[PDB]
Amino acid sequence: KIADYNYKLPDDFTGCVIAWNSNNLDSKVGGNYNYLYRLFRKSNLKPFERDISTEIYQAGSTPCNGVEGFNCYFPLQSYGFQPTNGVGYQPYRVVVLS
Amino acid sequence: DIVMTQSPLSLPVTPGEPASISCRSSQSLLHSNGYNYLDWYLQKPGQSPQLLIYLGSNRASGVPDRFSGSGSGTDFTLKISRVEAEDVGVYYCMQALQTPFTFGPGTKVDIKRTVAAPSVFIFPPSDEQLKSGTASVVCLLNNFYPREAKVQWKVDNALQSGNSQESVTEQDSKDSTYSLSSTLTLSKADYEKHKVYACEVTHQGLSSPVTKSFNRGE
Amino acid sequence: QVQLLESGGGLVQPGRSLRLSCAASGFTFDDYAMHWVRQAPGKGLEWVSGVSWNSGTIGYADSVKGRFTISRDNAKNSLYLHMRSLRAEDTALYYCAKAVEMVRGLGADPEYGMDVWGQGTTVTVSSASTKGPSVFPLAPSSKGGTAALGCLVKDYFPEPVTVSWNSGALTSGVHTFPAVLQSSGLYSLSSVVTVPSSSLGTQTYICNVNHKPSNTKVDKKVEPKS
């Protein structure tokens, strides 16, 4: 999912990868509900793509018309960055230098 | 959310003397560097909201100089020093230490005029208008200055809230005229089950809050 | 010449997905913070959203938690806001602008600086039925003094309408007070004019109403019910 629908990184990478914890920052007083991530999309991106297609994800043929949450899947999943952030739960900031 | 208030709600000021408006916060805007984050903004009638000043005393090149910033801790003040009749308009203040950002109530400032007792009229709805199924009783508060005068709609001495909508025009250049059309909405059945409708006006210059009351038919 | 173009307006149903685009020009785009400001029609102005220099979402307002999206097209110098699940009151005169504070100027990332308000569009978020306009004479009372008579435009849709007085012959004292909006998206305005009270006979009282969406140009008359 992180590859196909979150962010399709090019398979060949001329550079370096750096990731680090951001639990004390990328987490709100009681959970960073304002930050989401793209997990719902029927189409694949080009490598290094800025997708601004935030239109309501429609996996079927339901005439949503803009209606959300009823046979109209919300395109984004919500990071819950609460003080419950463990080793796997922590917000890891990631940079790729190509 | 940081509790914010703006005071006073409206202050009519005279050109030639300074003015002081204040925004009060529930948190101290001091930072590790010690800088507050209160920015002052303005708007005119017919204008989009516009900036006044940054952080009160931390200044950028090009900001207007007549508007000064002072205050401490949680509570700060914007001071109108150079005087002009243009200063009239609505004022806002913002805090940028914590997210999300939020506006205060915002206050309106206008040039003062001599206090006149309002002329009050009352207008019964027309019968062919009554046929539509609702009664639109009108009251006219012409020439009350300031807008502080309050209106009270009373059917048979009813103390009521709601269903009364008072539209007030913009400050007319003639004697700061403030004309108010107050609409009271009544049911078709409610019209015929009561007799007297009274628009009451309470104004500072009106030692007697006037009670224009009319009756069904004539 | 800093310039911001707003698009995404028109007649739209509430509860439906909406796309708003603001184009930036006259200044290097992607080095500044940026702001959307809510402005409910018939009300004041309030902060709704923003985004950092790095295209980082500041967050969302109290009532809109996790259901709007703000994004930035750095390629063509543009910014987009998508809305979902509109109601009658989430209608706003949204404004687009940037931040004054520059990168590496004066700690932490500066994100304030409501500076240059691009003229925000007027997205009409409401679901009201087609109401035939109901213009009506507010008849003159027999008022020395100054007579007050009017014309009321109520139960009409869409909102855009215009009232002239005696086809431009009457100009002194005209005030079209704002249309009070009702529960069912009903609009009710009253244009009131104060006129000399000694001319109740010589003046035939007409008001011209123009509902352009319905092409309703009507030359009605004001008469005292007596």
Curated annotation (Swiss-Prot), chain A:
Residues 39-74 are annotated as: Disordered. It comes from the Viruses. Changing residue 61 to N: In strain: 20A.EU2, Iota/B.1.526, Omicron/BA.1, Omicron/BA.2, Omicron/BA.2.12.1, Omicron/BA.2.75, Omicron/BA.4, Omicron/BA.5, Omicron/BQ.1.1, Omicron/XBB.1.5, Omicron/EG.5.1. Changing residue 85 to T: Reduced host ACE2-binding affinity in vitro. Disulfide bonds join 64-72. Changing residue 62 to K: In strain: Delta/B.1.617.2, Omicron/BA.1, Omicron/BA.2, Omicron/BA.2.12.1, Omicron/BA.2.75, Omicron/BA.4, Omicron/BA.5, Omicron/BQ.1.1, Omicron/XBB.1.5, Omicron/EG.5.1. Residues 32-40 are annotated as: Immunodominant HLA epitope recognized by the CD8+. Changing residue 37 to F: Decreased HLA binding to NF9 epitope. Increased binding affinity to human ACE2. Attaches the virion to the cell membrane by interacting with host receptor, initiating the infection. The major receptor is host ACE2. When S2/S2' has been cleaved, binding to the receptor triggers direct fusion at the cell membrane. When S2/S2' has not been cleaved, binding to the receptor results in internalization of the virus by endocytosis using host TFRC and GRM2 and leading to fusion of the virion membrane with the host endosomal membrane. Alternatively, may use NRP1/NRP2 and integrin as entry receptors. This is Spike protein S1. It comes from Severe acute respiratory syndrome coronavirus 2 (2019-nCoV). The chain holds residues 417 to 514 of 1273 of the full protein.
